[PDB]
């Protein structure tokens, strides 16, 4: 195998994904250059778990996921095992057990528009939280109160989905990051993604 | 995952120095630790930033060649070294801690993760 891994395809991708409709990526039968990531300037968040980022060149996995989308600053913290808020709970939830890296940067000036990006959407309300990786691409009617909706918009029947409005003057806690979750799977099967 | 615990603050006239201490409860390794100030009424300022490789730093404009930030890997701690101190300087100093790429600096408050309880500094005019 002397593919070398196209993280350049989901890193420097034009379009990001919204988060409520989180991109995966499966990366396979391929050489993964880590040390190029880890060894820049380029991340703001680079967070490993049941692994380190130095030695990622060192390692061997059956396959790696790689989830992409956007979210505010504020929420990265989010994308992490054991969290809460409306990004863990509704829209991406990693396992307990998450083993992988979480990459993020301000994107600023590629998803934030003069008068607001309004493309960026999340999901403000569910009935219950997401089981790690589920994706929810629904848009039902969201029944707040008492009275079902029927496909009618009222009073506590809500359009579940709310855009990020993103302007380049936000405060930067406002301000689109793109993100990026490396998921590393081991199982009885030949390791197909290594380092060099 | 980590605590920040600071020292070394003080009162100094015009011209002095002091040296702050951010001492990680973890490893500091993974870590860029920053330095900020907040003064009554103003909004806080990023003083200085050293990557997690040790070997990129920043400092705001006006503290270049007065304020050098260091840092020891052995004892997981981050230096303030303080000289050339003036009115202006005088605020509460925070360190505080982030896990991004190796060789990553900012000034992003929000970026940060862990803040150091503060230490306070006066420049006595």
């Known amino acids: 195998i002397t593919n070398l891994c196209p993280f350049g395809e989901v890193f420097n991708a034009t379009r990001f994904a919204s988060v409520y409709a989180w991109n995966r990526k499966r990366i396979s039968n391929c050489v993964a250059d880590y040390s190029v990531l880890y060894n820049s300037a380029s991340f703001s968040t680079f967070k490993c778990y049941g692994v380190s980022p130095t030695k990622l060149n060192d390692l061997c996995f059956t396959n790696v996921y790689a989830d992409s989308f956007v979210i505010r600053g504020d929420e990265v913290r989010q994308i992490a095992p054991g969290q809460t808020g409306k990004i863990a709970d509704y829209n991406y939830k990693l396992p307990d057990d998450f083993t992988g890296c979480v990459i993020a940067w301000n994107s600023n000036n590629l998803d934030s528009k003069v008068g607001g990006n309004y493309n960026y959407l999340y999901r403000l309300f569910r009935k219950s939280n997401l089981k790690p990786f589920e994706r929810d691409i629904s848009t039902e009617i969201y029944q707040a109160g008492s009275t079902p909706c029927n496909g009618v918009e009222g009073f506590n029947c809500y359009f579940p989905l709310q855009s990020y409005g993103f302007q380049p003057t936000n405060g930067v806690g406002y301000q689109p990051y793109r993100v990026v979750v490396l998921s590393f799977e081991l199982l009885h099967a030949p390791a197909t993604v290594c380092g060099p | 995952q980590v605590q920040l615990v600071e020292s070394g603050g003080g009162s100094v006239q015009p011209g002095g120095s002091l040296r702050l201490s951010c001492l990680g409860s973890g490893s500091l390794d993974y870590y860029a630790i920053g330095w900020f100030r907040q003064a009554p009424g103003k909004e806080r300022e990023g003083v200085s930033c050293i990557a997690s490789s040790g070997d990129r730093t920043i400092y705001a404009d006006s503290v270049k060649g007065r304020f050098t930030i260091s840092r020891d890997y052995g004892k997981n701690t981050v230096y303030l070294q303080m000289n050339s101190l003036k009115p202006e300087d005088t605020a509460m100093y925070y360190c505080?801690?982030?896990?991004?790429?190796?060789?990553?600096?900012?000034?992003?408050?929000?970026?940060?993760?862990?803040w150091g309880q503060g230490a306070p500094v006066t420049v006595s005019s």
């Open positions: 505080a801690a982030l896990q991004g790429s190796y060789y990553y600096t900012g000034f992003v408050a929000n970026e940060y993760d862990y």
